[PDB]
Design an enzyme around this catalytic site. Structure first.
Site, PDB file in Angstrom:
ATOM      1  CB  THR A 200       1.834   4.379  -0.524  1.00  0.00           C
ATOM      2  OG1 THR A 200       2.417   4.699   0.646  1.00  0.00           O
ATOM      3  CG2 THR A 200       2.090   5.267  -1.634  1.00  0.00           C
TER       4      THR A 200
ATOM      5  CB  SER B  84       5.574  -3.078   5.779  1.00  0.00           C
ATOM      6  OG  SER B  84       6.310  -3.146   4.424  1.00  0.00           O
ATOM      7  N   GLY B  85       2.940  -2.878   3.265  1.00  0.00           N
ATOM      8  CA  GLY B  85       2.532  -3.617   2.080  1.00  0.00           C
ATOM      9  C   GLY B  85       1.070  -3.885   2.231  1.00  0.00           C
TER      10      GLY B  85
ATOM     11  CD  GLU C 286       9.930  -1.537   8.575  1.00  0.00           C
ATOM     12  OE1 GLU C 286       9.461  -1.454   7.292  1.00  0.00           O
ATOM     13  OE2 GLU C 286      11.052  -1.164   8.797  1.00  0.00           O
TER      14      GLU C 286
ATOM     15  CG  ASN D 221       5.546  -2.433  -0.211  1.00  0.00           C
ATOM     16  OD1 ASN D 221       5.222  -2.293  -1.273  1.00  0.00           O
ATOM     17  ND2 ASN D 221       4.801  -1.156   0.182  1.00  0.00           N
TER      18      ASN D 221
ATOM     19  N   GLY E 156       4.476   1.742   7.610  1.00  0.00           N
ATOM     20  CA  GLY E 156       3.593   0.762   8.471  1.00  0.00           C
ATOM     21  C   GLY E 156       4.330  -0.183   9.134  1.00  0.00           C
TER      22      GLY E 156
ATOM     23  CB  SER F 116       8.876  -0.158   1.717  1.00  0.00           C
ATOM     24  OG  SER F 116       8.441   0.097   3.162  1.00  0.00           O
ATOM     25  CB  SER F 117       6.193   5.240   2.454  1.00  0.00           C
ATOM     26  OG  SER F 117       5.227   4.819   1.496  1.00  0.00           O
TER      27      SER F 117
HETATM   28  N1  ADP Z   1      -5.990  -1.230  -3.956  1.00  0.00           N
HETATM   29  C1  ADP Z   1      -4.911  -1.842  -4.469  1.00  0.00           C
HETATM   30  N2  ADP Z   1      -5.114  -2.127  -5.986  1.00  0.00           N
HETATM   31  C2  ADP Z   1      -4.095  -2.721  -6.332  1.00  0.00           C
HETATM   32  N3  ADP Z   1      -2.858  -3.234  -6.062  1.00  0.00           N
HETATM   33  C3  ADP Z   1      -2.638  -2.723  -4.689  1.00  0.00           C
HETATM   34  C4  ADP Z   1      -3.763  -2.417  -3.805  1.00  0.00           C
HETATM   35  N4  ADP Z   1      -3.336  -1.919  -2.683  1.00  0.00           N
HETATM   36  C5  ADP Z   1      -1.818  -2.316  -2.530  1.00  0.00           C
HETATM   37  N5  ADP Z   1      -1.613  -2.740  -3.784  1.00  0.00           N
HETATM   38  C6  ADP Z   1      -0.353  -3.537  -4.125  1.00  0.00           C
HETATM   39  O1  ADP Z   1       0.572  -3.825  -3.175  1.00  0.00           O
HETATM   40  C7  ADP Z   1       1.734  -2.743  -3.043  1.00  0.00           C
HETATM   41  C8  ADP Z   1       1.788  -2.420  -1.564  1.00  0.00           C
HETATM   42  O2  ADP Z   1       0.935  -1.443  -1.309  1.00  0.00           O
HETATM   43  P1  ADP Z   1       1.461  -0.068  -0.489  1.00  0.00           P
HETATM   44  O3  ADP Z   1       0.242   1.224  -0.748  1.00  0.00           O
HETATM   45  O4  ADP Z   1       2.680   0.809  -1.043  1.00  0.00           O
HETATM   46  O5  ADP Z   1       1.618  -0.489   0.796  1.00  0.00           O
HETATM   47  P2  ADP Z   1       2.002   0.375   2.256  1.00  0.00           P
HETATM   48  O6  ADP Z   1       0.762   0.211   3.275  1.00  0.00           O
HETATM   49  O7  ADP Z   1       3.152  -0.056   2.593  1.00  0.00           O
HETATM   50  O8  ADP Z   1       1.933   1.873   1.760  1.00  0.00           O
HETATM   51  C9  ADP Z   1       1.439  -1.812  -4.213  1.00  0.00           C
HETATM   52  O9  ADP Z   1       2.642  -1.107  -4.895  1.00  0.00           O
HETATM   53  C10 ADP Z   1       0.593  -2.691  -5.017  1.00  0.00           C
HETATM   54  O10 ADP Z   1       1.554  -3.435  -5.872  1.00  0.00           O
HETATM   55  O1  VO4 Z   2       5.522  -0.837   3.242  1.00  0.00           O
HETATM   56  V1  VO4 Z   2       4.953   0.647   3.874  1.00  0.00           V
HETATM   57  O2  VO4 Z   2       3.725   0.531   5.129  1.00  0.00           O
HETATM   58  O3  VO4 Z   2       6.275   1.284   4.586  1.00  0.00           O
HETATM   59  O4  VO4 Z   2       4.560   1.947   2.866  1.00  0.00           O
HETATM   60 MG    MG Z   3       3.738   3.465   1.719  1.00  0.00          MG
END
Ligand code: ADP
Ligand code: VO4
Ligand code: MG
Ligand code: 2OW
Lengths: 768, 155
Positions: free
Chosen positions: A183, A178-179, A451, A223, A449, A226-227
């Protein structure tokens, strides 16, 4: 640097300057002295050997510390030509600190993507970088892996080239806790194909995610965005590679979040987006205040997030719905049902004087709920307090105490919300489906992800089990199917055991007599309790299943009933309410009122167990994935505080270890990761030496044998030619070089024709 | 230049002397050519050198020399002899154009081949591409690349 000109201002964040390349290359270095040694706090540290004495080395660390270690604990540093290398499969010395330090050194230069064999590693920058604009999209188009720096756009382009060359469906499988960045990278893959095709389906595919994130994403302790659902996005292409259509499959939205929050988390974004007062007419329409603390279902944890502008986000959500072609009636019905859910949680109940029966305690919030839902409030309240049962032409009522009504009220709000989210996905797909012919697809997987919270329940088991299965899919593709391919094809190969297999943990969860199967059986016993379930888990698994252990309870932390040794860590699970969560029962009297609603949307939303449905979704997803060529993106969390540019060595090391990054690079180096059918080899590479092919296998042998190449880097299979990735890159460079020379020669013949055409006109005036 | 033994018969020399005269654009009608029109005369006389091969026999001239440095027939003749010594087969040409054959159906999109000849290798002008491509596309705007290779090789 001129070769990097097409990338614009993104160029220094993608590839180092030629000036830096010359600086690194010539920096001070001694292969004998410059090593890595283990460190109790930093995993590994860079060190310089001072003395060699009787099987032990005395070295000085990068932190100014004299350490004495055994010779077999010392690992060699790669020479400076390998500094910040784009593909870690190319390093001379492949070991844990070489990978770790190559990743750290690129991340320090804000270079967040690194190839590791045929897959890719990405480290969360926690900062906006100018690497995702339309100029960078254009610059990556059709570039080979060698000529372009590592990026999510190049993984996307490579998948597209594999699609057309091999004639097979592709998947982009984005892993991480997670984070980590799943996404973000998923939306970048979508952006890549949308922007390429643009040079309204393209607008619509990009706008699908803000609409889904308003209703399916939320702030958790890990996050801010978070999705809380899984998704598989398929981007459909015609036979020649033109963008044709797209579709979205969503999996298991977290229902409890709608009505419940833990201390450090929020409910879904939409509630706070509405309450922002950015569109004051929504508050008037929904008959609500601007205070989240006025609504029980949404204010149990946090209500504001520092990094989120809920006013700005409601405008993004409302504009996404417009681009997606949702009508005013469709948009307003979604807002109204969200408002009705807010009111629904505020309906209070009390016990009757002489009986253990619930009765309304005020009716104001029930009136507002029913009004927005197109129901009669007296029917709603009677349905909740006295659900009907059919007994021979009479609807006799079932008694309910306040605990039962509160639970039923919650179950109903969770159902309306989940069905509304599912309606929205179906409606997005209706606009994304163009009825345009297609042959292929590139699927992008974005799961919720791994968590670990202070309180881990049924929702954390389902999530963590998904991550376990996805890691095992990587293990299977990389280490099992890969070695099987070599053997079937008759390629000389000795089986390697990589120690990457999560079957014992997966079996504990999904096989008969496992965690899910025991839960499902207990759901079929009317007298079962959370403690009969807890006893059955212990009797079947404590001291029998390696991955099942006692809980690790700590004083100032919430209570757990068992711990599970997952791939990414040991998680302590709390078992309360799992039977109810699995059965997910609903008051059918109120469901009938929803069916007879004057609000068409609620009427259509309502027109065995969660674990069984989850297990079925997973294994059906795993078989869609098996019929695709997978491409993996391993997202890494750098530190536990969301600090940009800061790396926590043990945390990064832990992730790389449990992801099997090193083992994955090894099979790519040791094996033959690229392969092509003999007929297809002739079509693509006859251009290299047409004289060598004046039988498709014999032709491939003659052609490859005529080249000035390392003849150990390719092997002949029963139906395919196998290559090392490095040889394939060289063959592709040779093919491009020879194509350029052939075009030059066609142009010379073409200049000949044009000059001869003009010469014939000149001769006709005087001599002909 | 001096090392070049002229092998052509005196009758060929006179045939080439006339072709070279047809290219005369000098105001005094002095029967000379600019360094920049050498390629054209080598081509008019049956040669197919690349732009690089023309520049090598010209002694790597500057754009100024290509525009306004004059050449007589006596300087041209050893250049024609040297170029005639040094091309690519029909098979190489067909394999080069097959790269752009997405389906493997024997044709290439007209606009794609026009784009390739004007961007890749020693780029042809849009005007040179227009002149060369005239009446070569079918009803679907496609080009039979192996028929096109035969067309340019017989030209
Ligand atoms: N490549 C990236 N560039 C900039 N910020 C990023 C990047 N990847 C992640 N982040 C930051 O980290 C946060 C969490 O990423 P996200 O894709 O939502 O995580 P997850 O793996 O949980 O889906 C994003 O909303 C953003 O603030
Ligand atoms: O924080 V996520 O892995 O659930 O999107
Ligand atoms: Mg996500
Ligand atoms: C190095 O540069 C690149 O990344 N590319 C150059 C062009 N390539 C086209 C191309 C040539 C030769 C073979 C294949 N196919 C192949 O390896 N297939 C394969 C390999 C493994 C598995 C699990 N499944 C299917 C192929 F697409 C692909 C991009």
């Amino acid at each position: 640097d001129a070769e990097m000109a097409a990338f614009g201002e993104a160029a220094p964040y993608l590839r180092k300057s030629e000036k830096e390349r010359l600086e690194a290359q010539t920096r001070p270095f001694d292969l004998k002295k410059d090593v890595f040694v283990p460190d109790d706090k930093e995993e590994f540290v860079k060190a310089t050997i001072l003395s060699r004495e009787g099987g032990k080395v005395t070295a000085e660390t990068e932190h100014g510390k004299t350490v004495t270690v055994k010779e077999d604990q010392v690992l060699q540093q790669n020479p400076p030509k390998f500094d910040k290398i784009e593909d870690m499969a190319m390093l001379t010395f492949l070991h844990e600190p070489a990978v770790l330090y190559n990743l750290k050194e690129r991340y320090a230069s804000w270079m967040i993507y690194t190839y590791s064999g045929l897959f890719c590693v990405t480290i969360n920058p926690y900062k906006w970088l100018p690497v995702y604009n339309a100029e960078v999209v254009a610059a990556y188009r059709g570039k080979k892996r060698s000529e372009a720096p590592p990026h999510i756009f190049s993984i996307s382009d490579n998948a597209y080239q594999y699609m057309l060359t091999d004639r097979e469906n592709q998947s982009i499988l984005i892993t991480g806790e997670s984070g980590a960045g799943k996404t973000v990278n998923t939306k970048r893959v979508i952006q890549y194909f949308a922007v390429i095709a643009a040079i309204t389906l393209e607008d619509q595919i990009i706008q699908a995610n803000p609409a889904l994130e308003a209703f399916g994403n939320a702030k958790t302790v890990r996050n801010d965005n978070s999705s809380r659902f899984g998704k598989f996005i398929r981007i459909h292409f015609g036979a020649t590679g033109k963008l044709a259509s797209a579709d979205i499959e969503t999996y298991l939205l977290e229902k409890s979040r709608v009505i419940f929050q833990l201390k450090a988390e929020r409910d879904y974004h939409i509630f706070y987006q509405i309450l922002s007062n950015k569109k004051p007419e929504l508050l008037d329409m929904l008959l609500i205040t601007n205070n989240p603390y006025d609504y029980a279902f949404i204010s149990q944890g946090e209500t504001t997030v520092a990094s989120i502008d809920d006013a700005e986000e409601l405008m993004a959500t409302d504009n996404a719905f417009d681009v997606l072609g949702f009508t005013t009636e469709e948009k307003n019905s979604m807002y109204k049902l969200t408002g009705a859910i807010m009111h629904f949680g505020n309906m209070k109940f009390k016990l009757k004087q002489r009986e253990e029966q619930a009765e309304p305690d005020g009716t104001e919030e029930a009136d507002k709920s029913a009004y927005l839902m197109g129901l009669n409030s007296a029917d709603l309240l009677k349905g909740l307090c006295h659900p009907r049962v059919k007994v021979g032409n009479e609807y006799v009522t079932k008694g309910q105490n306040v605990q039962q009504v509160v639970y039923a009220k919650g179950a109903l709000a969770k159902a309306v919300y989940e069905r509304m989210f599912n309606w929205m996905v179906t409606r997005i797909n209706a606009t994304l489906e163009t009825k345009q012919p297609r042959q292929y697809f590139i699927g992008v997987l974005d799961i919720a992800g791994f968590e670990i919270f202070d309180f881990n329940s049924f929702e954390q088991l389902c999530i963590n089990f998904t991550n376990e299965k996805l890691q095992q899919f990587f293990n299977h593709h990389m280490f099992v199917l890969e070695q099987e391919e070599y053997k079937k094809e008759g390629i000389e190969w000795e089986f390697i055991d990589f120690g990457m297999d999560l079957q014992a943990c997966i079996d504990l969860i999904e096989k008969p007599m496992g965690i899910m199967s025991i839960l499902e059986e207990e759901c079929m016993f009317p007298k079962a309790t959370d403690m009969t379930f807890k006893a059955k888990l212990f009797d079947n698994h404590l001291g029998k299943s390696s991955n099942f252990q006692k809980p690790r309870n700590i004083k100032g932390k919430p209570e757990a009933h068992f711990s599970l040794i997952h791939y990414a860590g040991t998680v302590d699970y709390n078992i309360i309410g799992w039977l109810q969560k699995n059965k997910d029962p609903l008051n059918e009297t109120v469901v009938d009122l929803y069916k007879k609603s004057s609000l068409k949307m609620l009427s259509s939303l309502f027109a065995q167990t969660v674990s069984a449905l989850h297990r079925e979704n997973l294994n059906k997803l795993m078989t869609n994935l098996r019929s695709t060529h997978p491409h993996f993106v391993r997202c890494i969390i750098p530190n536990e505080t969301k600090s940009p540019g800061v790396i926590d060595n043990p945390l990064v090391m832990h992730q790389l270890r449990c992801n099997g990054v090193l083992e994955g690079i090894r099979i790519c180096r040791k094996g033959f990761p690229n392969r092509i059918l003999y007929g297809d080899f002739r079509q693509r590479y006859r251009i290299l030496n047409p004289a060598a092919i004046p039988d498709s296998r014999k032709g491939a042998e003659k052609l490859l044998g005529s080249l000035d190449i390392d003849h150990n880097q390719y092997k002949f299979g029963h139906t395919k030619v196998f290559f090392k990735a490095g040889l394939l890159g060289l063959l592709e460079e040779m093919r491009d070089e020879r194509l350029s020379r052939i075009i030059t020669r066609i142009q010379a013949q073409s200049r000949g024709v044009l000059s001869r055409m003009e010469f014939k006109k000149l001769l006709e005036r005087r001599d002909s | 230049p001096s090392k070049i033994k002229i092998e052509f018969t005196p009758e060929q020399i006179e045939e080439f002397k006339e072709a070279f005269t047809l290219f005369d654009r000098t105001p005094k009608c002095e029967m000379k050519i600019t360094y920049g029109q050498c390629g054209d005369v080598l081509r008019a006389l049956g040669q197919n050198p690349t732009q690089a091969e023309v520049l090598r026999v010209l002694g790597k001239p500057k754009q100024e020399e290509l525009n306004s440095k004059m050449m007589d027939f006596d300087t041209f003749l050893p250049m024609l002899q040297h170029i005639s010594k040094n091309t690519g087969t029909y098979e190489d040409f067909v394999e080069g154009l097959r790269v752009f054959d997405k389906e493997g159906n024997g044709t290439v999109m007209g606009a794609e081949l026009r784009h390739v000849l004007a961007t890749l290798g020693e780029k042809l002008t849009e005007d040179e591409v227009e002149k060369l491509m005239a009446g070569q596309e079918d009803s679907n705007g496609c080009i039979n690349y192996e028929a096109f290779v035969k067309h340019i090789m017989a030209g």
